[PDB]
Amino acid sequence: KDQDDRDHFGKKRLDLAGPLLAQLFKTLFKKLTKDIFRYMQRTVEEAHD
């Protein structure tokens, strides 16, 4: 076989606003949990209301 072709447009993909927001929002959502958990932890850590 010939070596692979890297510019073959069949193997590209285009990230439109769907994906790009997803990749973005996803990480921004972790950060939201992590903080919630930490607060959730630290408040239980000190049995705060």
Binding site: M40, T43, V44, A47, H48, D49
Partner: protein, 189 residues
């Protein structure tokens, strides 16, 4: 301890579509010659497929360095695949691509009302969650504390004190020696 019970049953494996799989979580094998058929209990007359005649080194077994109660029931005699009659089947098998989940209930309310509870709504706890003296009698108990258990911690003594904190801790500090670290620590011994 394992037991090869008989392992000679001519078990026949069948591959089936999901609608069949769900229905299985009677029969009437109407084989005919090798155009093997069978009648299912009502449903259709779904024939068997000679999906794989010869099946070696394959056996059924059940159980009940930990051991367990093994039993070798039967051997695969031949493997079968379901033959779906096809009218409704293809009518639903093709229609197996006719399901999905829902979109988002984009909140039909006015915008104003919904945000009211987000800010300073001044309400809380609606969901319960993480809501959180005689020197004689003291010494008599202190001697009792010393006598009953020389390893008498303050908490085991203060709870047993059941009296003002002054008499137990102060009056007993003379004939009772309390260690700070180590095993017999805080022990009115």
């Amino acid at each position: 301890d394992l037991d090869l019970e008989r392992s000679n049953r001519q078990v026949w494996l069948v591959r089936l579509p999901m609608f069949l799989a769900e229905k299985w979580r009677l029969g009437k094998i109407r084989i005919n010659k090798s155009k093997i058929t069978l009648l299912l209990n009502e449903p259709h007359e779904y024939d068997l497929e000679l999906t794989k005649k010869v099946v070696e080194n394959e056996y059924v077994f059940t159980e009940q360095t930990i051991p367990k109660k093994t039993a070798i029931v039967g051997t695969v005699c031949h493997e079968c695949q379901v033959m779906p009659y096809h009218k409704i089947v293809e009518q639903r098998r093709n229609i197996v691509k006719l399901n999905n989940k829902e979109r988002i209930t984009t909140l039909d309310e006015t915008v104003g009302v919904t945000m009211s509870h987000t800010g300073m709504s001044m309400r809380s706890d609606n969901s319960n969650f993480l809501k959180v003296m005689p020197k004689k009698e003291i010494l008599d108990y202190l001697f009792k504390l010393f006598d009953e258990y020389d390893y008498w911690s303050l908490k085991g003594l203060k709870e047993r004190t059941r009296q003002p904190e002054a008499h137990l801790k102060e009056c007993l500090d003379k004939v009772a020696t309390l260690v700070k670290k180590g095993p017999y620590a805080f022990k009115y011994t």
